[PDB]
């Protein structure tokens, strides 16, 4: 009774890979499928050792290890389109390392992933990332503001938004995040009422709020 015979009728739904530690790794595509497999192993239908894995869990695990041994490495995401040969995207600007160091890093990653034959490291451009983000928000016609910091870019989308706008935004952001991850660019989406709650005011360095006719309030520059 092979393991593939136990996972189901839809043979193409799962992928079995042998690992150097003498263990079978069942790669899955989503949570629902992950739990469909884990139930089979946890029930004990199979009798040797086996494990279930997916891209999100592995990205978390590897990030946690990097936090300890390479606490200043600037990177984006690890892609597992080909689970036998992952691709790791590093920033070209914000990292200074030699070719030798990169090779060492590669070998240590290979030690963390006993199902992978090698890890390919690719250098990506920050300007490219930022440009795709701003082009996406323009193409979708959302109102936004951009803030720049040394380590990152932030886009603030806030105010009174219509249903159509909210839907477009959610779809786009979900698409972007799956490519670039959430380390360099952050999108803040916040529904605001009217800033001042239907009250007249004067803006600028001498601004003030009219609480009511005959009643002035001086909170701040506006």
């Amino acid at each position: 009774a092979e393991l593939d015979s136990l996972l189901g009728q839809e043979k193409e739904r799962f992928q079995v890979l042998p690992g150097r530690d003498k263990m079978l790794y069942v790669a899955a595509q989503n949570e629902r499928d992950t739990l469909w497999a884990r139930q089979v192993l946890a029930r004990g239908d199979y009798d040797k050792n086996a494990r279930v894995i997916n891209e999100n869990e592995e990205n978390k695990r590897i990030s946690i290890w990097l936090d300890t041994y390479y606490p200043q490495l600037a990177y984006y995401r690890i892609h597992f389109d080909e689970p036998r040969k992952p691709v790791f995207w590093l920033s070209r600007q914000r990292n200074t390392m030699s070719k030798k160091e990169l090779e060492v890093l590669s070998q240590k990653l290979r030690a963390l992933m006993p199902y992978a034959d090698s890890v390919n490291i690719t250098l990506m451009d920050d300007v490219t990332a930022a440009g795709q983000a701003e082009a996406g928000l323009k193409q979708q016609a959302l109102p936004y503001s951009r803030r720049n910091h040394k380590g990152g870019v932030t886009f603030v989308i806030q105010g009174a938004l219509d249903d159509v706008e909210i839907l477009r935004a959610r779809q786009f952001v979900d698409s972007y995040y799956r490519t670039w991850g959430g380390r360099y660019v952050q999108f803040a989406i916040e529904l605001k009422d009217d800033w001042l709650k239907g009250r007249s005011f004067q803006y600028g360095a001498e601004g003030y709020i009219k609480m009511s006719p005959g009643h002035w309030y001086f909170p701040s520059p506006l």
């Binding site: 007249s200 004067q202 803006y203 600028g204 001498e206 601004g207 009219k210 006719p213």
Partner: peptide, 24 residues
């Protein structure tokens, strides 16, 4: 209103509007 200085009226009586204009 990122720049300068102005007034955001909400069905305000002209007395309160031109009073706000008085400083300029």
């Amino acid at each position: 209103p990122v720049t300068g200085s102005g007034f955001v009226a909400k069905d305000d009586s002209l007395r309160t509007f031109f009073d706000a204009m008085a400083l300029q």
